Write a protein that binds this ligand. Structure first.
Ligand SMILES: Nc1ncnc2c1ncn2[C@@H]1O[C@H](COP(=O)(O)OP(=O)(O)OP(=O)(O)O)[C@@H](O)[C@H]1O
Lengths: 835, 430, 158, 143
């Protein structure tokens, strides 16, 4: 039963019983210490990294040994713990030990009453101390005076030392023996604190232990890190090599053999001092409480509130679980517990300061933004790792712009361009591992409570590194110059708008001239700006004026042109998504919504990246204004994570790869008004580009969104819709009834998909006139698809007569695209027809 | 709610009520200081990357703790702020702290009139002072002299040193304990200033805090760039490695593990010295008033004109918006808010001086608005103008001067596509 | 009293026998802090000298350090330490690139020589250069405020 | 002790349990053999004795502290997981070689994220990608 009170100071000095994390080792060491005496140098080493609690451990060992020392068969007196870092820089350790030993002895003489025995054993003690003072210069001398030879040849004493000469260890050995007689103890414990704070001063501890602490009446307990003593020992065996030899034999053959010798003298210097059978490894908090399935060797509980009852105290893994899950907006499972495990493997001081800072402000805040509490808690603890890894550190500049830059500068060092945006604690280095949980808190804090910041992190944050894992990585110091150019061109960290990112993102996927020269790309299709001959069928140069209402608005938000030797023109889904990320940010006023469609269309000049060789429109605004009304009351309960945004991009990116190549072929002569799956056109590619985003959001919303604990897709193969709709239709059908079963609505369980499926900007792209897979029986799926969508959003996207025109083989369309199918894709050969 | 009158002699010291922005944070820190001594190293860090008025906040804490001692359950006597960069190059911080502790204690002794504990405690006070003088050589000695060993065994001390030897941290903690009784207080406050000018002298501050200021009757408030302490601590851990090992094991695998080891010693040095739960961040004006997207955590009002009343006041977001929109000839909207947000991220003392230099001068003209904002910025923002290489000579202003600066701005901004918008989307604060 | 505290300026090490001198509190001093602060004793000298000389301020005048710019560091350190009095006006000439050359050289001396030798990777070397450059401006802008600097005009400007 | 059979000048016997006598002691080669074939989950053969001969070449201080650690934790634990006991015994003795080789040394990393990465660093230094992953004691360096 171990309970840690977070509102207590929780310091190594101010830690009483009943909260010792190391209670199994404290008892195990003490009995093993007593066993050694009850049965030669006797040194116990308590291993452990920095912040493990080594000072707190020995502090408990002395407390558990000084109690009932005379009430047990083997009496062991303990000196106060010696801290090698806090001692005077030049004070010998033997001086410190003797000074602390003299105080213990003198205090015992003042407890005696028989003056005959008091005076008999005080003359001996003063004689031994005076003899130690006489020979103390042997340590603090830079030369050997010839007149000291008389001291070695003096025998004017009754000691009758075994070996001749003024051996200081011999003088100290009987000094300890005299002290044991006075204190009436069978041994004396010399506890040495760790040297981790300043480890160059721990050499005197090592040399003193092996020289003067060899007696059977001395028990030495020294803690620290063997990884740190090894560097101290190795650097001192190198000082035994003459400087001239090192300078004259700098070549590898003899240099390597010397290094083999030093590591082979270091190895046995540790084995001589701290024997393996006596070392004790301090267990980190993960090894105590254990995992969910593995039995917890101990039971650690945390008092997360002031005045909390002992029964009320909650388990530490649950306490970390609450902070990690709510702080990162993350749901119970492998991903949430992967962060919790990493926080447990942290040094105890670092972990106990994350919890202390998080739960102190959490309680104080109520007297909420839990992700903000964890962001500040992790910022302070992982600050040394943030500085090392080069992440943003100023707190007045925290925001979306200063976060997407951090995600790019993190995966660049992590080298995980495929899954780095997940921000999982997987990096081998501890600095990048520490930043991963801090960055995850940053993403779960900024994007929380707003849909606009979710899409900016999706495109600018997660996307920018994927648009680097391809289309920029083939060009690769040159790599650091490529990074410098790429982030300056795309202006990540200072983006003007999400749409502005998409237009630059259009060029990089365009300034990489793909094979077959077809102007069909990942999530973007090129369209001709000029008219020529040789165009069969109804294919024609794209004209924006053909579309009406939302149809004109939807393309205007999607069209993006880049200035080059010739003005390329593109229709991307990133521009469509970036437009949504811009409308959501602004207010519900009509004036601001109008500018969103008109931020890029006719006032931007997207020069190619340097790494290249060369009214009814008011009705459209009304629908967007109505949708923005929904966003401002639904997005307040959104809980996006760094995992969800990373996952949603991953599926959305994978689909855009499938639809890119699976439609690079089906661009045949009769593809206009495509009705079979073997014919595709600009209305087909863009329909599944948009439907890819609506699916990636849909499938991994229920999978990973923290608002709904349960899973509503159920168990099955989560195939994604490419050139088809049944894959999307299968999942959207089966989700609907489960919420009715659980008495939950579509908006309070999948707020992200509900908002994006009800966005009028992408509504014309869901059912383009050109893009409809009205097969003999697949049209029933789309008929169900339209019915499901019309019920999710609450409004009929297309009227009964409007739907019949798309399926059955004039009409004006104010809600669906019209001229996209007739558009001519650059680099497409319109000579081969569908067979 | 804070309401600032912009027509005043502009005294940072006379500001005591209704004019100090950081009162909300100061009260929380002071209450935290008092609560940390009820139950032990209490070290508080007032963090900030640049500016923000560091020295005035810690001084404001000293005033808040030196006064109102009768009402509070626990009273704290505060040493005068110690500037580590304005001290003799070899004087230890322990000497500086004790000397200012002696000055406070001795001045209190002259306040005594009951001449029974006046000389009883003074005699005891000088006993601790002389004993600290006796053991002061341990911080300045370049070698150990065997004659010191006799001193370490002197067990005639009347104050009962529990651990033997001459431990200055043990002598100093009893010296503080006696000082607390004399001053009739508890938990003496030690405040340190920034080490920005010469951060080589901040290592003695860190080593003194962890060694000598570990007492439960000692609370420390440190200030400065915590990114600069990291470079100070990290560079000192390399000093532990022997010069022979460093110049012999020069392989990449050996150099990486040496850096990684120091990455962990430095990491735990900051956590031990400045605990995360005790670090204090100076809130900027934007955080205090909110982003206007929703209600902020604090409401601050400004008296633009002389004679305005409590209700006759406007929010700083509006007062800044009034200056930006009129000064920059900008319309109300999103692009006008890009400048008010940046103006709200500035240090408060800098920000309200721009407001004072603009609004008050706008009165005297009434008895061109854009030049009033230009003059107001030039007076207080001149440091960045010089740093970036722009035009500072006021007589030379013009399109020939202006167009040269704008091309100079976009040259440093590395963005020629949208650089001429002059939107504060840059990276450098200047 | 100033002569008593002058050893602090010129001492290769701290001598413990001066600790009893730092505790020699006096009544005529009326010093805010009694830790033998040279910047406080000198402020009384200037305040007393103004009373004797019947002047509202004292102009301390420094020439330039072009011939030997090592000697300019003691000028900068003295100005920011002892010449902070309200009754003191300091006018200093010299190339500001030379004075910035001093501080940048001294700001690097704060870094431990072992840190500079061991951490020579471009990711950390460039981060130090960002910080030392940031330190020299704050040192320059605090010693010589920009609103008080005066630039001598060449012939073209004249 | 020599190779298998007598094959050696001195007949060194070792005691692996407290209260044991001088008559029921085990051969030092066999005591290393039992701790190796049980610890490494190997059978008797050339491969097991290849580790035994490598362990026998080790310094007596290093060799005894492997035997002392293995047979003092084994007796206490059982008054099982034999590979765990050998892992802890070899962790302390070979610790200086583990540090030099760059192998993971944190005792809370002892899964396979460390292990699957550990043998890649080991094989990389061994300069033998063909037979390195057998983890044979066939290297030319003591580390
Ligand atoms: N038994 C414990 N109970 C509560 N908190 C503990 C315990 N052990 C460690 N801690 C926490 O971990 C921190 C580290 O303690 P400790 O000072 O012993 O670690 P160390 O870094 O190994 O030692 P040192 O201070 O000597 O460098 C403590 O300050 C405390 O916050």
């Amino acid at each position: 039963k171990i309970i840690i009170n977070l509102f207590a100071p929780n310091l190594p000095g101010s830690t009483k019983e009943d909260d010792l994390i190391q209670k199994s080792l404290r008892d195990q060491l003490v009995e093993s210490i007593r066993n050694s005496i009850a049965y030669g140098r006797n040194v116990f080493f308590v291993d452990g990294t920095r912040g493990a609690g080594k000072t707190t451990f020995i502090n408990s060992v002395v407390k558990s040994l000084n109690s009932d020392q005379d009430d047990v068969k083997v009496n062991i007196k303990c000196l106060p713990t010696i801290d090698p870092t806090k001692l005077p820089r030049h004070e010998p350790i033997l001086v410190t030990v003797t000074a602390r030993l003299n105080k213990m002895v003198s205090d015992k003489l003042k407890g005696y009453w028989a003056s005959n025995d008091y005076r008999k054993q005080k003359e001996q003690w003063q004689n031994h101390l005076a003899q130690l003072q006489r020979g103390l210069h042997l340590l603090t001398d830079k030369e050997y005076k010839p007149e000291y030879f008389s001291d070695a040849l003096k025998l004017d004493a009754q000691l009758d030392y075994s070996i001749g000469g003024q051996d200081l260890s011999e003088i100290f050995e009987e000094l300890v023996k005299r002290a044991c007689e006075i204190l009436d103890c069978k041994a004396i414990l010399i506890t040495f604190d760790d040297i981790d704070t300043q480890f160059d001063a721990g050499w005197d501890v090592l040399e003193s232990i092996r020289k003067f602490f060899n007696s059977r009446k001395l028990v030495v307990v020294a803690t620290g890190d063997l990884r740190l003593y090894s560097q101290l020992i190795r650097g001192k065996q190198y000082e035994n090599y003459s400087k001239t030899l090192l300078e004259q034999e700098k070549e590898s053959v003899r240099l390597a053999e010397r290094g083999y010798m030093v590591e082979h003298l270091e190895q046995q210097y540790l084995l001589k001092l701290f024997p393996v059978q006596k070392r004790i490894q301090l267990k980190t908090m993960l090894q105590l409480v254990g995992e969910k399935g593995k039995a917890g060797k101990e039971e650690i509980k945390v008092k997360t509130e002031p005045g909390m009852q002992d029964i009320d105290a909650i388990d530490v893994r649950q306490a970390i679980g609450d902070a990690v899950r709510e702080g990162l907006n993350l749901r119970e499972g492998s991903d949430a517990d992967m962060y919790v495990n990493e926080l447990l493997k942290q040094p105890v001081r670092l972990l106990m300061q994350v919890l202390q800072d998080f739960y102190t402000k959490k309680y104080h805040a109520t007297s909420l933004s839990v992700p903000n509490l964890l962001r500040n808690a992790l910022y302070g603890s992982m600050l040394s790792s943030i500085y090392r890894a080069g992440l943003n550190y100023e707190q007045h500049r925290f925001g979306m712009d200063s976060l997407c830059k951090d995600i790019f500068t993190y995966v660049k060092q992590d080298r995980d361009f495929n899954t780095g945006f997940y921000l999982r604690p997987q990096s081998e280095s501890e600095a990048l591992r520490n930043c991963s949980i801090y960055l995850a808190s940053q993403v779960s804090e900024n994007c929380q409570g707003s849909l606009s910041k979710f899409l900016q992190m999706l495109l600018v944050g997660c996307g920018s590194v994927s648009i680097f894992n391809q289309f920029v990585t083939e060009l690769a110091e040159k790599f650091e110059q490529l990074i410098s150019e790429y982030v300056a061109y795309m202006s990540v960290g200072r983006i003007e708008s999400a749409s502005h990112w998409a237009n630059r993102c259009c060029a990089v996927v365009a300034n990489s001239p793909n094979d077959e020269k077809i102007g069909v790309f990942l999530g973007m299709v090129q369209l001709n700006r000029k008219s020529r001959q040789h165009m069969p069928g109804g294919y024609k140069k794209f004209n924006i004026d053909t579309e009406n209402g939302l149809a004109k608005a939807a393309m205007a938000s999607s069209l993006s042109t880049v200035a080059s030797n010739n003005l390329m023109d593109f229709c991307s889904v990133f521009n469509l998504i970036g437009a949504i990320a811009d409308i959501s940010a602004c207010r519900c006023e009509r004036s601001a919504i109008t500018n969103a469609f008109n931020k890029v269309i006719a006032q931007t000049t997207c020069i190619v990246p340097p790494w290249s060789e060369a009214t009814e429109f008011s009705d459209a605004i009304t629908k967007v204004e109505q949708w923005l009304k929904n966003v401002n009351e639904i997005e307040i309960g959104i809980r996006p994570s760094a995992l969800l945004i990373g996952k949603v991009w991953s599926r959305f990116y994978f689909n855009l790869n499938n639809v890119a190549d699976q439609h690079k072929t089906r661009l045949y002569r009769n593809a206009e008004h495509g009705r079979m799956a073997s014919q595709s056109n600009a209305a087909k590619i863009m329909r599944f580009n948009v439907l890819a985003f609506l699916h990636a959001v849909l499938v991994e919303e229920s999978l990973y969104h923290s608002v709904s604990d349960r899973e509503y897709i159920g168990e099955g193969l989560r195939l994604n819709p490419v050139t088809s709709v049944d894959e999307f239709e299968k999942k959207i059908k089966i989700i609907g009834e489960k919420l009715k079963a659980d008495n939950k609505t579509w908006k309070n369980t999948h707020p992200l998909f509900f908002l994006l499926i009800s966005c009028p900007i992408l509504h014309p792209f869901i059912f383009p006139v050109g893009g409809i897979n009205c097969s003999v029986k697949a049209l029933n799926k789309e008929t169900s698809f339209n019915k499901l969508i019309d019920e999710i959003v609450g409004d009929k996207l297309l009227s009964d007569e409007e739907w019949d025109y798309l399926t059955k083989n004039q009409q004006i369309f104010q809600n669906t695209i019209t001229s996209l199918n007739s558009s001519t894709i650059v680099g497409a050969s319109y000579d081969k027809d569908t067979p």
